[PDB]
């Protein structure tokens, strides 16, 4: 039924689902504490992405396990667009590359690319939902049915992105060029997340399946 | 940047490297103990061909030597991997490292960390199969990896980066043209383009895991100066 939404209805839903900007509460203690509070709101966001809560709870958790760090990063990048050379983790926590620096420079470069492209908010929220759905889709009959559903939702977000660029009055050549540019930034965000996740796992901190499930607040029947 | 889409596809098809073979050395038959040695030799021989393929990707040799090396240092494992997945597409459940080196998932449960990567490779092969990926699309995807993977990692640098994005846009055009010319609708074109490019996030993911597996041998990774030597040919 979420697959009957129009592109306009898909955009409004995603804009309405957007999480709040949190405030910061040892730089590394503060970043971890900020991440942990953001995760809760990301779970609330995820449930409002059309199509997501039609999946089993088991597969929602898996998507969330695979994607949460990418989602944290693209949001960091989004809200840093307007602050060249700085990362706005929170309104009370702007850091530059002087205050690890490899991932920091990668984040800054992503924010610079979003600036060069004049990434719009409507496009940004489509990109987050693609990240949520795409990041774990490579990992039974029921499993196969779920991946079919995920790809249908992915296709409709692609339709939506294109719709926005049409509305913006880009030519069809510019639409598919810009679509491609945006999706290629997602492979760099995947790269950035791989580095963080290796770092967390090295600690021997990564949100467990049970913690994510608890946050999803499953229905009681 | 002057080429048509047909011309782009023509050049990429023409530059395709050969399918290489694992050694048929009788003094070194296949066993689980000889495996990473055979696989390493094969990759080392493929890298040589990959260098000379890269130089034939339109736009690539327009870059500085320094940047060409940086792009290859970022992308070589992803390019090996996508070549592997393409070779394996028509053999469900198996990875076709070479025509004489076709492995299944339990042959992979020899080394620690290996089965996990094997399954991601097999999943990618599965995805190619159900998308019925075409050869002409494959070569576009491989060239996007080459140009894209190191680009996010100075006046000359700003010109380099402008140039790389203009070549990516041309490849994007070429991909759409391929799909247009087959007969896909505009909707199907944009949906397929998106499907194809999202696979590149997984390939990056796999390359990071594989890169993590390779350093876990502590032997293997081509250094920056080694790659530069390979690309820095005389005339
Ligand atoms: C839920 C798991 N709990 C265990 C903590 O895992 C964490 C801990 C910290 C981060 C922060 C964080 C916080 C908020 C944000 O919006 C974004 C980020 C982005 C991020 C890069 C990834 N990060 C860093 O510090 C950083 C920045 C620059 C270079 C190297 C590292 C994310 C996840
Ligand atoms: C040029 C750099 N020096 C050489 C050392 O790096 C190497 C050593 C070995 C491989 C093989 C290899 C060979 C050929 C191929 O086409 C592709 C691959 C793919 C690959 C994943 C990476 N691999 C493995 O064994 C493997 C497979 C599954 C799960 C875990 C590991 C590649 C690179």
Numbering used by the authors:
A (entry chain B): 306 to 330, 341 to 414, 421 to 460, 465 to 529, 533 to 549
B (entry chain A): 308 to 460, 465 to 530, 533 to 548
Quoted from the paper:
Estrogen receptor alpha (ERα) is a ligand-dependent master transcriptional regulator and key driver of breast cancer pathology. Hormone binding favors LBD head-to-head homodimerization, helix 12 (H12) binding over the hormone-binding pocket, and exposure of the activating function-2 (AF-2) cleft where transcriptional coregulators bind via LXXLL motifs. SERMs and SERDs are comprised of a heterocyclic core that mimics hormone binding and a side-arm that disfavors the H12 agonist conformation. Rather, H12 packs into the AF-2 cleft via an LXXML motif to sterically preclude transcriptional coregulator binding.
We solved x-ray co-crystal structures to reveal how the T6Is bound in the ERα hormone binding pocket and to understand the structural basis of differential efficacy. In these structures, the T6Is are well ordered in the ligand binding pocket and form canonical ERα LBD antagonist conformations with H12 packed in the AF-2 cleft. Hydrogen bonds are formed between the T6I core, E353, R394, and a water molecule while the side arm forms a hydrogen bond with D351 to favor an antagonistic H12 conformation that is docked into the AF2-cleft. The T6I core is superimposable between the 10 structures but the side arms adopt divergent vectors near H12 that correlate with ligand-specific antagonistic differences. Interestingly, the F425 in H8 is rotated away from the ligand pocket in the T6I structures compared to laso and RAD1901.
